[PDB]
């Protein structure tokens, strides 16, 4: 269960050595994502978090593709990568569903939390937003999900 190598934890299955450096290159980035730069602007402060949410997204796709695309890792090792929290299980479970393949986060599909309606505009296809903008011809206004920094999770884009 724990990320730490606490004596309770089980030693890694076979194929882990091959992907070990590739994961660490995410790990040493995260250590540098949280170091607390001092940034005054409120527009910058969340832009720092947008680095973590991405590095968390990017590390799970790596584990998702190996097993569920390239089939390049054993099911023992994968089940062990989920315990150790190198991959977010509930996120990956959306990646297997239809329509959700490229999703940011589990927060972006939260129906509840958002004030009216639901599901960040971050989930709306660019192809569409251009068109409701087309009525006004204003080249939209959308750039980044306030939770994430996403632009178009929706799996067409």
């Amino acid at each position: 269960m724990p990320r730490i190598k606490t004596r309770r934890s089980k030693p890694a299955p076979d194929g882990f050595e091959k992907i070990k450096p590739t994961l660490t290159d995410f790990e040493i980035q995260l250590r540098d994502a949280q170091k607390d730069k001092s940034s005054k602007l409120a527009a910058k402060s969340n832009e720092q978090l947008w680095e973590i949410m991405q590095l968390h997204h990017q590390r799970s796709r790596y584990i998702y593709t190996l097993y569920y695309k390239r089939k390049a890792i054993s099911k023992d090792l994968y089940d062990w990568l989920i315990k150790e929290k190198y991959a977010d299980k509930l996120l990956i479970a959306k990646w297997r569903k239809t329509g959700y393949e490229k999703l940011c986060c589990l927060r972006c599909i939260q129906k509840n939390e958002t004030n009216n309606g639901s599901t960040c505009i971050c989930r709306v296809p660019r192809a569409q937003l251009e068109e409701e903008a087309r009525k006004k011809g204003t080249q939209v206004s959308f750039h980044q999900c306030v939770h994430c920094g996403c632009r178009g999770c929706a799996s067409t884009d």
Binding site: H57, K102, A127, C150, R151, G152, D157
Partner: peptide, 23 residues
């Protein structure tokens, strides 16, 4: 719209998915 139109169309975004910047 059409599938080919979208598939070609996306690579326009700078960095894969989905953090890749449109424009």
């Amino acid at each position: 719209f059409t599938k080919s139109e979208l598939k070609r169309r996306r690579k326009t975004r700078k960095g894969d998915g989905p953090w890749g910047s449109w424009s």
